[PDB]
């Protein structure tokens, strides 16, 4: 026996010695040293100090620069708002709780923190899907005489909200559940214990298929088509050095985007798959925070890739931060 079970939790540490306590009631210094809880807090501090300015600045320059308020940019605004739900739903909470060594807000605060942090990351995830569907529709021109307007952009944002609610709300009404994960300082979906009263197994399947595989297929199809269309256009227009440059830039950005998506979600999907197929094995607290580390750092590196590496946003940000220079 490798863990300790409670009504609303699973502590990944055996109670053979009798030292295990409810992660809602007492510190968990028996599954990690205090200095590791301090390093957890230090990491949350890093993600706040970087993730908040980068994502807030994205909203701010959009308010100050008229040319940013285009429909194809709406979804990037959505990305920045979603990353802020991650910053204040999860990161700040986990900074606070880690300094106590346990989840001081109780089962209720566990559902709040789990709902808003999972909602933030799922809005961000489906924003990357919708961004690719749109780029594919606009560049590859799969439809006859279709012009992408403001109402399509709003439809795309609402679709991300609905898809993220379809992931974050069921654990509040009895399909899966929210419990403290890893070092017991942050709450997330229970994708690792076979809690049958909330039907965890079928929810993890539904998560794996609908919120990982389908986003993976759509992103790969849409950008595969986009790279193919751009390479086809450049091959048929080799007298244009700019078009050859565009082809190289699009291919480089597409590689960065799909690699960044894999770095963000493949560890969560891999660990969940391994736990699913090897049901009945020891999975420690710090090992469980590895896929959390990868997914949460995307609140910093997604806006670097999708905002700061975008010519228009970078120009306006530099202008805003340097008071008025180019």
């Amino acid at each position: 026996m490798n863990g300790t079970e409670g009504p609303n939790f699973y502590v990944p540490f055996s109670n053979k010695t009798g030292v295990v306590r409810s992660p809602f009631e007492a510190p968990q210094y028996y599954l990690a040293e205090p200095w590791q809880f301090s390093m957890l807090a230090a990491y949350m501090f890093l993600l706040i100090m970087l993730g908040f300015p980068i994502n807030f600045l994205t909203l701010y320059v959009t308010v100050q620069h008229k040319k940013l308020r285009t429909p194809l940019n709406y979804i990037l605004l959505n990305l920045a708002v979603a990353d802020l739900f991650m910053v204040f739903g999860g990161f700040t909470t986990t900074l606070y709780t880690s300094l106590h060594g346990y989840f001081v807000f109780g089962p209720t605060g566990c559902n709040l923190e789990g709902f808003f942090a999972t909602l933030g990351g799922e809005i961000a995830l489906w924003s990357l899907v919708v961004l690719a569907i749109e780029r594919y529709v606009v560049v590859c021109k799969p439809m006859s005489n279709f012009r992408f307007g403001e109402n399509h952009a709003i439809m795309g944002v609402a679709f991300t909200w609905v898809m993220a609610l379809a992931c974050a709300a069921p654990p509040l009404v009895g399909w899966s559940r929210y419990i403290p994960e890893g070092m017991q300082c942050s709450c997330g979906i229970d994708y690792y214990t076979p809690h049958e009263e909330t039907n965890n197994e079928s929810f993890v399947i539904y998560m794996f298929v609908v919120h990982f595989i389908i986003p993976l297929i759509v992103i790969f199809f849409c950008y595969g088509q986009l790279v193919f269309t751009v390479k086809e256009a450049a091959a048929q227009q080799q007298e244009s050095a700019t078009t050859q440059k565009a082809e190289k830039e699009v291919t480089r950005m597409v590689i960065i985007m799909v690699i960044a998506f894999l770095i963000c979600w493949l560890p969560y999907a891999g660990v969940a798959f391994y736990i699913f197929t090897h049901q009945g094995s020891d999975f420690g607290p710090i090992f469980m925070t590895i896929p959390a580390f990868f997914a949460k750092t995307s609140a910093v590196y997604n806006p670097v890739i999708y905002i700061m590496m975008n010519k228009q946003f970078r120009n306006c940000m530099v202008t805003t931060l340097c008071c008025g220079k180019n």
Binding site: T70, L72, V138, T229, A233, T243, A246
Partner: peptide
Amino acid sequence: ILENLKDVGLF
């Protein structure tokens, strides 16, 4: 294709 690439933020 170039104008569409600029619109979507890829070039």
